[PDB]
Curated annotation (Swiss-Prot):
Belongs to the class-C beta-lactamase family. This is Beta-lactamase. The lineage of its organism: Bacteria, Pseudomonadati, Pseudomonadota, Gammaproteobacteria, Enterobacterales. One of its GO terms (biological process) is response to antibiotic. SUPFAM superfamilies: beta-lactamase/transpeptidase-like. A beta-lactam binds at residues 61, 117, 147, 149, 315, 340. The keyword Glycoprotein does not apply. Changing residue 116 to A: Reduces binding affinity of inhibitor compound 3 about 4-fold. The keyword Cell membrane does not apply. Class C beta-lactamase which confers resistance to penicillins and cephalosporins. Has benzylpenicillin- and cephaloridine-hydrolyzing activity. Has weak cefuroxime, cefotaxime, cefoxitin and oxacillin-hydrolyzing activities. The gene is ampC. It catalyses: a beta-lactam + H2O = a substituted beta-amino acid.
Length: 358
């Protein structure tokens, strides 16, 4: 814990906790590709369990980075292509709005206005089919970006189909396990319950509720230690010994689409570094992050650019997190908190810390 890391992290996170009234938080800074951890406050207020380096947090949409990388890995394995029609892997989707909608579109929220959430009315596999069959695009495919669980959710489920494994099984065996993320979970097991923080929403203890495509779109829980390892694995995919995985991490950080200052990868979003912090800070606020935006195609996709700020925010009703790293600088940060507080606040903190270490 170099005193300068200590200094920036404390001067930055202390007023962040106080002003946002965050009950518990873990922060990892990756500096020169080595992790340094910081924990505050409570995993469980009622039971006075402190946040530790073992506490599980719900990642929310940061789960989409795992999804984009398990997708990338299926690509590298030869099992899927992003140029393939959604219908190759779901022939029952016969409604003709599906014509022209490829897995790149599902992955990058460019299919033509798939909604943000799957309706809670959808619980069975037949219900989900019905949902996608009935859906009417607002736009032609690859013209507009609209952030959507129902979009990258479906990417995740179709992408694992030719493996013959369930999504969770594919995730575990091709991603969590080779990267040694042994306390990262889609479903948290009884033995691990004791590490599972409560989320806090209006002062009530909550956990994520089950939902269609939850695992694929918002369903990973993880510790600050594995999340640091996750950052390290995406900072330096070339130290990854597993070829399809190292290659899927590259593919998740290719640039497929640009809107304004940002580039859409698989799960990840990227901006050229040096970035203007106003750009990433303001861009992180939801009604601009969740807004319908026109995209320009990157034809062909730019391979992972090292001088990028690569990041993803994610929330559940009781959790807020953020991951950001700069490959060229070997620098990254993870921020896990068991309160959902505004995204700008998160990115603002992350940028002040990484800027000063930059
Ligand atoms: O605490 C609970 O009971 C609960 C919380 C969130 C959910 C849904 C997760 C919301 N996160 S998301 O991926 O769907 C999303 C959507 C718009 S922004 C965003 C995010 O994670 O930042 C379900 C149950």
């Amino acid at each position: 814990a170099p005193q300068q890391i200590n200094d920036i992290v404390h001067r930055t996170i202390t007023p962040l906790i106080e002003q946002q009234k965050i009950p518990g938080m873990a922060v990892a800074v990756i500096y020169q590709g080595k992790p340094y951890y910081f924990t505050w406050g409570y995993a469980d207020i009622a039971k006075k369990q402190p946040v530790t380096q073992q506490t599980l947090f719900e990642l929310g949409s940061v789960s989409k980075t795992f999804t984009g990388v398990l997708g990338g890995d299926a690509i590298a394995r030869g099992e899927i292509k992003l140029s393939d029609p959604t219908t190759k892997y779901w022939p029952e989707l016969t409604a003709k709005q599906w014509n022209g909608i490829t897995l790149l579109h599902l992955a990058t929220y460019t299919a033509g206005g798939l909604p943000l959430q799957v309706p809670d009315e959808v619980k069975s596999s037949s219900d989900l089919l019905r949902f996608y069959q009935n859906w009417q695009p607002a736009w032609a495919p690859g013209t507009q970006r609209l952030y959507a669980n129902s979009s990258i959710g479906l990417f995740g489920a179709l992408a694992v189909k030719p493996s013959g494994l369930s999504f969770e099984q594919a995730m575990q065996t091709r991603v969590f396990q080779p990267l040694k993320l042994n306390h990262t979970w889609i479903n948290v097991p009884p033995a691990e319950e004791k590490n599972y923080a409560w989320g806090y929403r209006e002062g009530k203890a909550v956990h994520v509720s089950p939902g269609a495509l939850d695992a694929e779109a918002y369903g990973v829980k993880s510790t600050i230690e594995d999340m640091a390892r996750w950052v390290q694995s995406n900072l330096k995919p070339l130290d990854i010994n597993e070829k399809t995985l190292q290659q899927g991490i590259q593919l998740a950080q290719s640039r497929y689409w640009q809107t304004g200052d940002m580039y859409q990868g698989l799960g990840w979003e990227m901006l050229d570094w040096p970035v203007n912090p106003d750009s990433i800070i303001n861009g992180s606020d939801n009604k601009i992050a969740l807004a319908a935006r026109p995209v320009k195609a990157i034809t062909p996709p730019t391979p992972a650019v090292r001088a990028s700020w690569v990041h993803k925010t994610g929330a559940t009703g009781g959790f807020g997190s953020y991951v950001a790293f700069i490959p060229e600088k070997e620098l990254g940060i993870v921020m896990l908190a068991n309160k959902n507080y505004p995204n700008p606040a998160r990115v603002d903190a992350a940028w002040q810390i990484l800027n000063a270490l930059q």
